[PDB]
Amino acid sequence: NDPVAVARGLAEKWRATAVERDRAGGSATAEREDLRASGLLSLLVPREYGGWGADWPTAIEVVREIAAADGSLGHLFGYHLTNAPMIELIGSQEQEEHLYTQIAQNNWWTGNASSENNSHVLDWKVRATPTEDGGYVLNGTKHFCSGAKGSDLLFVFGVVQDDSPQQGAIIAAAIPTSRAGVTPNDDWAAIGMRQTDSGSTDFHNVKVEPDEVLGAPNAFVLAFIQSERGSLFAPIAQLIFANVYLGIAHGALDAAREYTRTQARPWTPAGIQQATEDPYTIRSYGEFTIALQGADAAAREAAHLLQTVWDKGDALTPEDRGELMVKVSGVKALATNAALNISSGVFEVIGARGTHPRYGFDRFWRNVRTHSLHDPVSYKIADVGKHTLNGQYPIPGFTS
Amino acid sequence: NDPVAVARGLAEKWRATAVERDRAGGSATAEREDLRASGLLSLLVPREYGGWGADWPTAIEVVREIAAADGSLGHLFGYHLTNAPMIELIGSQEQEEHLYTQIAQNNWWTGNASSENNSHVLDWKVRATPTEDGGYVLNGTKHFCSGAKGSDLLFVFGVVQDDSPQQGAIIAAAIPTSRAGVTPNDDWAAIGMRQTDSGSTDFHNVKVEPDEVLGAPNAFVLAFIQSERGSLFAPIAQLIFANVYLGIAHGALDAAREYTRTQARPWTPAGIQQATEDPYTIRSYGEFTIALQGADAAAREAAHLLQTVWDKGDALTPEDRGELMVKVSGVKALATNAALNISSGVFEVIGARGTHPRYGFDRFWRNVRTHSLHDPVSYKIADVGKHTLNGQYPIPGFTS
Amino acid sequence: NDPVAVARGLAEKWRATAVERDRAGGSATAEREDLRASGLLSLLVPREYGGWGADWPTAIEVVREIAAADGSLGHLFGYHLTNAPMIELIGSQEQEEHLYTQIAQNNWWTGNASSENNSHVLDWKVRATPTEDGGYVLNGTKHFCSGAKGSDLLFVFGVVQDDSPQQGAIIAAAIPTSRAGVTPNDDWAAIGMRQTDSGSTDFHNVKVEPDEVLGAPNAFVLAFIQSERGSLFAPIAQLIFANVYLGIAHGALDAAREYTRTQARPWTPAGIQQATEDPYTIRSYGEFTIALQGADAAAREAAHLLQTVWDKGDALTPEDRGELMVKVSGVKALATNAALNISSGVFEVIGARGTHPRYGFDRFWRNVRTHSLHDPVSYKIADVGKHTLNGQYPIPGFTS
Amino acid sequence: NDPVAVARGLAEKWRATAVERDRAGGSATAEREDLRASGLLSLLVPREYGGWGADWPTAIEVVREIAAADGSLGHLFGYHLTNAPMIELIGSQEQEEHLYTQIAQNNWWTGNASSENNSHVLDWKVRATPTEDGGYVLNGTKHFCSGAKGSDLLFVFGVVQDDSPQQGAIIAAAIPTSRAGVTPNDDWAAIGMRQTDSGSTDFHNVKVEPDEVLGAPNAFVLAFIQSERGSLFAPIAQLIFANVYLGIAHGALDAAREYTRTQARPWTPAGIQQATEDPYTIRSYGEFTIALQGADAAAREAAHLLQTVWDKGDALTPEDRGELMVKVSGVKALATNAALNISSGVFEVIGARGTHPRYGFDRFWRNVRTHSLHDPVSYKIADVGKHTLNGQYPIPGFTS
């Protein structure tokens, strides 16, 4: 019933292995299995199809608890959350019902190999060839996927790239990851986010049934142009990312605080008696907490705003979407700066012995530092700027 | 029906004379008359005594709306709102019924010549001598008052300087400001907050009648010791200061934004055609927005927390009060830093021509630079650090 | 003899009047008379023509000493130093020997009504009509001059605006401020730099004799395209400004340190006994010192590079000029940011009583805050960027 | 013949193995031999004893050049340099001749196992039992050494701890690393500085002959109290650490710049065509450069000061020493803050593909983030503050 208490349960189980898992890399096989058994993969699926029917504020608190324990798992779980709502954003009422039921009844992980955020559609490596029955065949390798490996239902985008009428169209599809010719590779390596399985997936003559296709050809692109419901993709994904960073910064701050209390030593040349009494340590913790106090309050207001817009369904206006995306862009900036500042800053109050790999203290920083490059925070800042000054809204796309 | 519309009406009325009034300094006689006419002075008086019975977040949104038009007037009304609560915090039911009725029915301003926040009690200048009717006579000059000049009801503290059992006791009282022997000087000069009327008040043989004495000798100090309801003084007042700063910062950003859109020139040596399209200008506007976005959302949650605590009445616990002060201390820090950063930083986007006094663009920075020095923000920061690191709450006083 | 010692002695005298002069505005007639009688006006004229013959690093040290006492006088004197070198940068040998000699024999103040640093030339307010005798006739109001009012010798630019073959040409001339038709106005008004006399000058049929024309028509512009000696204009002026801001920052920091040692109170609720022992005050003074330490060391290294570049005369390469301008651009940024930060920041350690106008503690910030808008620091930062990343040098112009 | 050129020659090869050896950790055995064969090891040894006789500024420029290729090597080399000068600070004439000569003639690495910077002397792990011939016997395990492993000459401190009249005295000694009972262990581990060999050294009844003892019992401690020449220990060490951090910051900024220009893709959602033309990329690079500009200029100035004070021999006064340490302390804070800032910030301009471990882009941050904890920068800031405010010099000790 309360999914947060369920998430905190796993979080506590996982803290015993946090250092090892960041050290070893590869797939968080046992942890993915705990999330599976927990029920939480169906957190946003409406109750009537077996899910928890959670609102966005609650789902976001789940993501934060998980991200505090483990940035890779918060990311993996968070991004899994953004996949299914695509069904109801752009798909049919029949697909909604069927796919939501299956997700919730089977506790499926969903993965994606969808957008290429920074390439021209004619240059995306995953091509879709029209089929006689109205389906497509996919071929080509998507280089940056998210959770494809280990997923059950895979959300993939192909681009029609031959000379027919749908030339350049983006075909959105939800398909079984185990279908013949889908090959998720085990080739993800990064300084951080090491267990998010964000490697490549090969598609070899992969059939997509006409019924597996979500909306018309190019339905994502057309929803963006209009600011229709499918244009909520970016603010939803961006707000979850922001909250993964916040959850990581909390876990850095709690890790450092427990170390200051147990293992840090006072700077005896300055006459300090105990490490928890140093005036500058104290000021530091004060600054970390305050920066998070500001960033988390903004994240929470953005989540309520996302819920209000969500609840409008098809009646949302470009202006409702614009204003949400402006607020999220600010949260994302806030979260990115605070998380990078705290995860590097706590070292100053941990001290030289805390640089031993056994504590794995650089993992928070490496995780935030890795994902915060997913898209450039300088353009999140400029979107907010353009809105403040010119009342302009960002142009809807995969990242804004 | 809506106090914020009424404050917003006052805001537009004051706009044409914002510059000249900061230039001139002295009292804002006419703007104070405007406010007393609006009914706003009784905003927090409960309905059953004739007031609006608004709650904290609503009264705070009025303070910000005003602060934004005029930092001195935000602060003046702001601080006026914190005075009458003293009556229910430490006064008696009869005093409450008597004083609040009078305040709401006679559209009174309240002022104070109350605590000296950084001097030992036995050095406070206002000395109280007990008179055997159970009353008091006050002698001395309080150097820093707030709003005493121009007020109708004056909340005063004196210290017992004889050698009776009461010796050392702070004695709090509400008196009509025109009482014989009370002289509010017009001697307030400061770089900013020029119209806050924060000068000295002399007390010559001033009679405080027995029924004007709020609670027993030393009531506030004893309340601080226990975290009883008296000990809400500091977080109410500091939350209002923090929202005055934020209103100032929004007044600064609005002023800049209108100037950049109408008056600013493009930097032609860099190929810029529209000052509104300069990439750095846009960036600075985003960073100002984002800083306020965090500090405002934090301030909003703290007003809701203050309402929850206040609503508990006498059943509040030391933890309730302690967690509220730590939250408010962080909001005071966030608001300080955001307001100074924005009120100084807008000049960069305004440009050389906006340094002309006809714009009075430095009034926002001068108003925040002045009042932020009321109590040191480094100890707000440290209080939050001591709680984060050590679990410890601030020691209750006039500023924490 | 020692120019810095003469400067310290004037600084002593002037510091007594510093608050009074900042609240006065208008011209610092008496202070400009002190400078004239000092002989310092010819500090950079070579000995052989009667001047002090000082190198760039010594002239700069004098500027800093003066700016620390008084930001307006610092800029007024420092901008004066920039003017005469235009004679040797673009004029003939006869004019150099003649004009240097007069400046030095007569102790002339030099003023400028020169460039419009953000207008296309055909829009410059000051038009040059050519006359048959080889001269020009000037008409227009140049809106922002520097020290035209109270100068003896005026460096003026005008644009040929007619249909002729020299159309668009910037004419450079050195003329007597006292020439008929030259009207410097007393219209300078600003939040800071109030005694820099940076108002407008009217030209009404002002005659420029062929022999007072500094070089060929449009020689400055040709100098910039070629990275010629004339293109040392911006580095020199930009390095002097940086030094003005540092000197003002030192003044703010010295004023604060005096106040902290004599007047500041300890914060007794923090249990502090002495203001000079508060840990966060000591940290703050440390941060201010450290920011200046870095910006000062960078300023000094750039003044030796300027000496080295200056001492090649016409043998300088575009590369020598580019590199210098890059370094100085970085100094302008360091100084701007250190000066704004220190001049605002010192209030934190001064405290509420120091907001009283009798201290004039905000003059430092207002001074730096006003002048730092002459040209946008963001494009200084971007120029350093483009060099760092791409190896491009700034395009030589009036401010780069 | 030019040591920076020689070190230039070596960096080009180390830069190419940088990634692997960081991912590898362990000792840099081939690299350490590269430096031996270079001859740089006797850089600071007087020309007259067969060394280079370089000055401090030159020696420092070599440390930066190495540090920019490899932070671990820079640290190792730079620390090595601090050792032999111990002989002239507190050792005799005879010791200088003999040991400088052996260091230079035999191209020895020197290592240390000297101070415990944050333990009372009676807690140090390395104890010294006085022997009847005026020698000592060392027992204990020093937990954190620098470059003891693979050294030829080893500088060791021991405390007298028994009954002896010498109780409390720190004994400094240089002994051959091959001496029986000396066991430098291979147990160094940390997130950064991975090849610095800063592990434990065991001493088992290690005999120190009377003429291997550098000065009197407790020489350093006595030299500190007096601010005699021995008290140059801290500023030499600290200034060396500051420049290792700056060389690392330069390597990070060089590695970023190469990637931005050859690998980085423009953000096409914002219309950017070339990664090198992004306005915000260009701004970040200007900012990194400008912060290093200030820091590097302040460090070069402190190296000249250190030369001056060094050259006074025993004529240095307590104030010369106090002044040098305040300067060095500001450089340490400037170098620490710049290097943290730039090594994390660059990732912003590299983008997501740059997080792949084949670039090892995080090694720069890991290196600085690790050694920056050696002693707390907040007390570097505070010493500087106590000097600025009160004129106090730091208490001389192993780190200040």
- Number of Cβ within 10 Å of residue B265's Cβ equals 13
User: Are both A1-109 and A110-217 of the same fold?
Assistant: no
CA–CA min distance B137, chain A (Å): 44
CATH level 2 (architecture), domain B1-109: Orthogonal Bundle (1.10)
In chain A, what residues touch D119 (CB-CB under 8 Å)?
Answer: 268
Chain B residue with the nearest C-alpha to that of C117:
B269
CA–CA min distance D280, chain B (Å): 8
Q: Is B260 on the interface with A (CB under 8 A)?
A: yes
Structure tokens belonging to residue D264: 């980085």
In chain B, what residues touch A289 (CB-CB under 8 Å)?
Answer: 330, 384-385, 387-388
CATH homologous superfamily for the domain D218-400: Butyryl-CoA Dehydrogenase, subunit A, domain 3 (1.20.140.10)
Report DSSP letters for D189-223, one per residue: --SS-TTS----EEEEEEEE-GGGEESSTTHHHHH
Whole-angstrom distance, CA of residue D75 vs CA of residue D147: 10
CA–CA min distance B142, chain A (Å): 33
Per the entry, the structure determination technique was: X-ray
- The hierarchical CATH code for the domain C110-217 is 2.40.110.10
Q: At what angle do helices C233-262 and D377-390 cross, to 10 degrees?
A: 80
Domain range list for chain D: 1-109, 110-217, 218-400
In chain D, what residues touch C295 (CB-CB under 8 Å)?
Answer: 294
Whole-angstrom distance, CA of residue B134 vs CA of residue A330: 59
Residue type, D287: E
Say which residues have a Cβ less than 8 Å from residue A165's Cβ, sequence separation at least 6: none
Interface of B with C in 272-291 (CB under 8 A): 280-281, 284
CA–CA min distance D39, chain A (Å): 32
Partners of B129 in the beta sheet?
Answer: B137
Say which residues have a Cβ less than 8 Å from residue D11's Cβ, sequence separation at least 6: D65, D66, D68, D69, D70
Partners of C201 in the beta sheet?
Answer: C142, C184
Which chains border B (3 or more CB–CB pairs < 8 Å)?
A, C, D
Q: Is B255 on the interface with C (CB under 8 A)?
A: no
Whole-angstrom distance, CA of residue D318 vs CA of residue D393: 9
Q: Is C271 on the interface with A (CB under 8 A)?
A: no
Whole-angstrom distance, CA of residue B153 vs CA of residue B104: 12
CB contact under 8 A, A293 and B334: yes
Whole-angstrom distance, CA of residue C135 vs CA of residue C130: 6
* CA-wise closest residue to B95 among B153, B148, B177, B39: B153
Strand B110-113 to strand C182-184: parallel, antiparallel, or no bridges (unpaired)?
unpaired
Say which residues have a Cβ less than 8 Å from residue B352's Cβ, sequence separation at least 6: C144, C373, C374
Over the range C303-333, which residues count as b (16 or more CB within 10 Å of their CB) and which as e? bebbeebbeeeeebeeebbbbbbbbbbbbbb
DSSP reduced 3-state for B208: strand
Residue type, D363: R
Classify A124 in phi/psi space as left (phi over 0), alpha (psi -120 to 50) or beta. beta
Structure tokens belonging to residue A163: 């000379």
Q: Is A370 on the interface with D (CB under 8 A)?
A: yes
Q: How far apart are the first and last CA of chain C?
A: 34
Say which residues have a Cβ less than 8 Å from residue B168's Cβ, sequence separation at least 6: B121, B122, B159, B160, B218
In chain D, what residues touch B283 (CB-CB under 8 Å)?
Answer: 280, 283
Expressed in Å, this structure's resolution amounts to 2.1
Q: Is C9 on the interface with B (CB under 8 A)?
A: no
| Tally of CA atoms within 13 A in the half-sphere of B387 that contains its CB | 26
- Number of Cβ within 10 Å of residue D207's Cβ equals 15
Return the beta strands (E) in A161-212 as ranges: 170-176, 182-184, 201-208
Q: At what angle do helices B279-311 and B318-350 cross, to 10 degrees?
A: 160
CB contact under 8 A, B268 and C120: yes
Chain A residue with the nearest C-alpha to that of B380:
A286
Over the range B138-150, which residues count as b (16 or more CB within 10 Å of their CB) and which as e? bbbebbbbbbbbb
Q: Is B267 on the interface with C (CB under 8 A)?
A: yes
Structure tokens belonging to residue A85: 């709502």
- Number of Cβ within 10 Å of residue A269's Cβ equals 17
Q: Is D337 on the interface with A (CB under 8 A)?
A: no
CB contact under 8 A, D117 and A369: no
CB contact under 8 A, A384 and B286: yes
* CA-wise closest residue to B96 among B81, B82, B109, B86: B86
CA–CA min distance D287, chain B (Å): 13
Whole-angstrom distance, CA of residue C184 vs CA of residue C148: 6
Structure tokens belonging to residue B342: 């924005």
Over the range D301-317, which residues count as b (16 or more CB within 10 Å of their CB) and which as e? bbbebbeebbeeeeebe
Whole-angstrom distance, CA of residue C342 vs CA of residue C202: 38
